[PDB]
Every structure is written in C-alpha cells, then in structure tokens.
Design a protein around this ligand. Structure first.
Ligand code: IPE
Lengths: 191, 191
C-alpha cells in the first residue's frame, strides 16, 4: 500500500491527469476503436476506410483526440494479459503513410512488449528492459518542457523506463500500437 | 550533442545543484577521503580512528557534509573505470555501527557496480540492471517531497534507475560506498 500511495501522491504533486480517447480517424485500417473510444483491437485484415491524411496507413497505430504542447501530463493504460503492445507519445509531424522506424529521431517515444515476455524501449538502438512483475496497467508520464517521457507499473509504482531527455518539436499525441490478433484488448483507463 | 544539452537543461530547470564534499568524520576507517573532500579511495587495512557516534563502523560508507530535508537536488560523481562502487542517499537515522542490509526499508537508496560489469539497484532483493554503455559520470537526483531517487549517465543523459516513489523520514545525506582496492578514486564533480 505504501508504494501505491506514494505513486498516487507523486502523480498529484506534479502531473495533470489526461482523459485520453482514441481518434478513429487516425487509426490504421486493421484497427478497431471501441464506441466509447477507450479500447483497441485488431482485425484479421485491413477494413475499408478512407485514406484521410491523419490516418496511419502502414504502422498499426492510433492517436488520442487531444495533443500536448506544454506541461506535465499522465494517463494509464490497461495492457492486461496482452502478449504484445506499444504505447507512448509521438509528434504531430511523424510520417503516417510511408514506413519510418518508430524511434525518437523520427518523432516516436514508445515502450512495449513482444512474445509475452520481451519488454523493450524503442530507443535506437532498442533498450532491453528488465521487469520483475509483468505490468497489467502502465502509466505514461510526459513533461513537455524538459523533454521527458517515462513509464511506470501503475499498480505497484515500480519504474519501467525513462527516455533520455530531449527537445520536442510541435504538439505531442498519445500513441497506441498493437500488431497481434489476440483476445485481450488494449484499454485506456479513464481520468 | 542534443542528448547532453537536454540533460543539462532538465537538471538546471528542476533540481538545485548540490556542491557535495565528503565528511571524513563519518567515513568507515578503511576509507581515505582526499584533502579537498572530493575524492574517495580505500586503504589496504582499517586505519586506527576514533569510533565517534557519527562514524560508519560496519559498512564501508561515507556521508556528505550537508543533508536535505526538502527540495530537489542533484550532484554528479566521476566513477570512471572503477570496477566497484555504490552511491546514492541515506537517512540520518540509518544503523551506522551494526550489520544492516543497505535497502530502502533500512534507509538507503543506492545503485552501483560490482566486479566491473554487474550493475545493481540496492533494492530488497537487489535488482540487476542492464546498462548498454557503462557510465563514467553518474548524476544522482533527489526530490524530497515526492520521495524520488533516480540516477543518470551524466555524459549522454541516459537513464539508469529510479526507485519506486517512497516517503522519507528525516534528513537525507549523500552516501558513497567502496569495498575494493582499485587504482581509480571516486571523485565528486563540483557544483
Ligand atoms: C559485506 C559488506 C559489509 C559489503 C557489502 O555488503 P553485502 O555483502 O550485503 O552486499 P551488497 O548487496 O550490499 O553489496
């Protein structure tokens, strides 16, 4: 209880709770956004969607509906028993159509999981993470002004990863990515 | 380059720069504190020194000359190629005379290196770290109010470790521990 309590108090001293919903107009055509816009699944094949400019056509990504240009913000994501996921932030100006490698140099700050047990930060090169207990819920923490993106196990307060401090260019968006077709959705925790 | 600049801007924006000097009165008798109080080495054998109450008698530890009871503070330590070292903060009330495990529950928040290649956080139990580039200079970051102790590579800005947010009791001192005889001293970088 003490580690959860200190995690709650820290998030109150410093970070504004963001109420993040998924924008279906940004979602790759293989993704399904839930009607309440909190949950994400994958289809067996691309669905028939317009190719509007905001849509990720290659990467299996979706954005939030609000961006950040300043300030300290957090949100929490129920990854549950998923075997695969990536979450974090990206710049408004990322390449959405052509492939680009999802790295900080290309405007992406994400961590995640592959093959049930391989936790990685998508630094370049990728950082192999050591996680003592697989997180069911992950907190994403942004400080725009200091260039900080960090990740915690939201249930026990343990730290997962902090990217090197950087300089952002333009607005940042919450980003979510799933590659697999598996029973458990990715779900955003309401603020 | 940019990662060093962003690390510099972050530490300047949010943390008070501590000018840390070693207190030889606190040092375990096997330690040698330099005349300028910036450098720490180990002697071959325990020196004959008085067992005054403030002196560490069991652990091979020394404190700084100033504690923190509030605020955000940072300092940097040149570890160079030294194969063994642990650094961080501890509570004024730690057990200095008798055997105790150096853990957060016992008032110590430290990380470091064993046998040239084994990075650990001194959590209970110890957390094995994976560090892609061995740091030569380590930044120690304290936020008293949010219970935060984190550690960075002070040359490239890469993150090393963040303890779970906690609650501190009383003053925190910079603490330094070396177990081995090695050519390379630990040296505190001035503010
Ligand atoms: C033996 C002493 C007094 C120094 C190291 O203590 P431990 O052997 O308990 O090891 P750490 O895990 O604290 O390095």
């Amino acid at each position: 209880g003490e580690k959860s309590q200190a995690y709650a108090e820290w998030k109150k001293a410093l970070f504004q709770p963001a109420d993040v919903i998924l924008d279906p107009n940004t979602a790759n055509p293989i993704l399904l956004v839930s009607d309440d816009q909190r949950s994400l699944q994958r289809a067996d094949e691309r669905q028939n969607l317009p190719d509007n400019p905001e849509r990720f056509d290659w990467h299996y990504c979706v954005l939030g509906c609000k961006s950040f240009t300043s300030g300290r913000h957090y949100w929490e994501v129920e990854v549950g028993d998923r075997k695969e996921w990536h979450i974090g932030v990206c710049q408004e100006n990322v390449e959405r159509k052509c492939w680009v490698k999802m790295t900080p140099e290309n405007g992406f700050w994400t961590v995640g999981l592959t093959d049930g047990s391989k936790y990685r930060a998508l630094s370049d090169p990728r950082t192999k993470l050591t996680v003592a207990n697989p997180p069911q819920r992950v907190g994403v923490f942004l400080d725009y002004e200091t260039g900080e993106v960090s990740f915690y196990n939201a249930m026990d307060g343990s730290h997962i990863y902090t990217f090197p401090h950087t300089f952002f260019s333009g607005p940042l968006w919450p980003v979510f990515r799933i590659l697999t077709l598996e029973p458990t959705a990715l779900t955003i925790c309401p603020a």
